[PDB]
C-alpha cells in the first residue's frame, strides 16, 4: 500500500547553529509530496531495500515496533547492523548475525553502542561510511496518515562503522502502522527561525 | 519616509546632510 509524505522528512543537515536565515543546502532529503510505501504490523515486517537512505516512520499506541536490522544479505554471510530499544536504552550492534526466518523481538562482531496516540519519525543514511540517525516524536490528531505540516528531525546517533547497506527490516515485538520513504539528493532552502529552529523548507 | 524601507571590512558612512537638513 501507499500514502503521501507532504512536508515530512526534513532534518538538521549539519551540527552548526543558524538563526533568522534562509540557508541553501544539498543533501539526501525526503522529496516533498512523494508516495511512501505504507505497512501494518497486523493482518508484517518484510525486508525492504534501503536505497540511498530511508525516512522511516510509525503511528503507534502500543510500542510493538522496537528496532531495525540493516545490511546487504541479512543472512550471516557478512556483517549486519542491529538497532533495538529495550525500554530503558537504545542498543546498537554490528555482527555476522544469523537472524530468524521471520525475525522479531521477544515480549563475529566489530562495533557496539548503548544509551493512534503518537507518531515516531526517523531518517537513516550512510555517507562516507558514517551511519547517521535522525528522529522526532509528535502527538497526532489523525489515525490514518502522516500529519500535513512541518517539523525538523534532530540527529540522535552517528556510527563510524564503514559497513555497506542495501537492505533493511523493522523489528516487531512477538512471543501499529509504519511508512517507508526513500531519500534523494535534493537542494533545499531551510528557514531557521529566531530560536535557531528549522520551521519551513523549500524542496 | 515610511514607504521606502558588517564585520568583514564592509561599512556604511553617514551622508553629509542629515534627513533633517534635507
Amino acid at each position: 500500500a501507499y500514502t503521501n509524505s507532504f512536508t515530512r522528512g526534513v532534518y538538521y543537515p549539519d551540527k552548526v547553529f543558524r538563526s533568522s536565515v534562509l540557508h541553501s543546502t544539498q543533501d539526501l532529503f525526503l522529496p516533498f509530496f512523494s508516495n511512501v510505501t505504507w505497512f501494518h504490523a497486523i493482518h508484517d515486517n518484510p525486508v525492504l531495500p534501503f536505497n540511498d537512505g530511508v525516512y522511516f516512520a510509525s503511528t503507534e499506541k502500543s510500542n510493538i515496533i522496537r528496532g531495525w536490522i540493516f545490511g546487504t544479505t541479512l543472512d550471516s554471510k557478512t556483517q549486519s547492523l542491529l538497532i533495538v530499544n529495550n525500554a530503558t536504552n537504545v542498543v546498537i550492534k554490528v555482527c555476522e548475525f544469523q537472524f530468524c526466518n521471520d525475525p522479531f523481538l521477544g515480549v563475529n562482531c566489530t562495533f557496539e553502542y548503548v544509551s493512534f496516540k503518537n507518531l515516531r519519525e526517523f531518517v537513516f543514511k550512510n555517507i562516507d561510511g558514517y551511519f547517521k540517525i535522525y528522529s522526532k516524536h509528535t502527538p497526532i490528531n489523525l489515525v490514518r496518515d502522516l500529519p500535513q505540516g512541518f517539523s525538523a528531525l534532530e540527529p540522535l546517533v552517528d556510527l563510524p562503522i564503514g559497513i555497506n547497506i542495501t537492505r533493511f527490516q523493522t523489528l516487531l515485538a512477538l512471543h501499529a502502522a509504519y511508512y517507508v520513504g526513500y531519500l534523494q539528493p535534493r537542494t533545499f532552502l531551510l528557514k531557521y527561525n529566531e530560536n535557531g529552529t528549522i520551521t519551513d523548507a523549500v524542496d | 519616509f515610511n514607504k521606502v524601507t558588517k564585520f568583514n571590512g564592509l561599512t556604511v558612512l553617514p551622508p553629509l546632510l542629515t534627513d533633517e537638513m534635507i
Partner: protein, 49 residues
Amino acid sequence: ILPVSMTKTSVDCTMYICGDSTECSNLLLQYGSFCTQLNRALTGIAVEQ
C-alpha cells in the same frame, strides 16, 4: 520620484581579503596598489553621493 544618492559604502579591502591575518596581508602586498585603488574608487563614489 527621482533617486538622488545611494548608500555611502566603504570596504576595507585588506580586512575583506585577509581578515586580521599578517600571513595573508604580506601576500596581498605582492599584488601592489590594487587594494589602495579599490579604496580610492569607493571613496570617490561616497564623496560623489
